[PDB]
Amino acid sequence: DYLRELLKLELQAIKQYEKLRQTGDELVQAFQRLREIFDKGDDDSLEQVLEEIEELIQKHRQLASELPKLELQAIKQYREALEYVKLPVLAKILEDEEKHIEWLKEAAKQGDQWVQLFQRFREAIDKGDKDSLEQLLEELEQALQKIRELTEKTGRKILEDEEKHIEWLETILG
């Protein structure tokens, strides 16, 4: 009964990292267009692209909130089924899922950091120019890729382990 449940959580997990993966691309490829429009110095076009990006963050950041909960969901059920069953493999999964939240919340800190910086950049256009705007975009473009570094590794790292968890569980089942 219960192993099919644990499976569904492990599938849903992948489907969530599947949707972040997608958002991560769009947010980066949107930032391309910002560097283009700001280089031309178009006042009208920039306003749209800034709102376009600010919206994309809310969606990405939405999903980034879910995963920490959904990896907890798993942990709950694995810990349950270890008090009763004590299978050697359910232990190994639990240990992965524990270290998956470690991975996440380290990179979710780096995410908050950057969401501030973007908002400061958007507020510099409101009230004059707080610095050469060139400098703040220059800072963002780098800190963007600093997140992208932590993401693609400590993101796909999980997707490897999560796929391994499914195969393990499917094996125990028929």
The residue (of 60 and 100) whose beta carbon lies closer to Zn ion is: 100
The closest residue (CB) to Zn ion is: 100
Unique residue bearing structure tokens 């569980």: 169
Cβ atoms of 148 and 108 within 8 Å: the answer is no
Selection from 148, 136, 108, 112 nearest residue 50 by Cα? 136
The residue (of 3 and 115) whose beta carbon lies closer to Zn ion is: 3
Minimum separation from the CB atom of position 24 to Zn ion (A): 18
Dist CA 37 CA 41 (whole Å): 6
Q: Where are the alpha helices (DSSP H) in the chain?
A: 3-40, 43-84, 88-126, 133-172
The residue (of 24 and 155) whose beta carbon lies closer to Zn ion is: 155
Minimum separation from the CB atom of position 63 to Zn ion (A): 15
Dist CA 31 CA 49 (whole Å): 9
Minimum separation from the CB atom of position 39 to Zn ion (A): 41
Cβ atoms of 158 and 100 within 8 Å: the answer is yes
Minimum separation from the CB atom of position 127 to Zn ion (A): 43
Q: Which two tokens stand for residue 94?
A: 């639990």
The residue (of 33 and 164) whose beta carbon lies closer to Zn ion is: 164
The residue (of 81 and 97) whose beta carbon lies closer to Zn ion is: 97
Minimum separation from the CB atom of position 25 to Zn ion (A): 21
Cβ atoms of 133 and 54 within 8 Å: the answer is no
Interacting residues with Zn ion (CB under 5 A): 10, 71, 97, 100, 162, 165
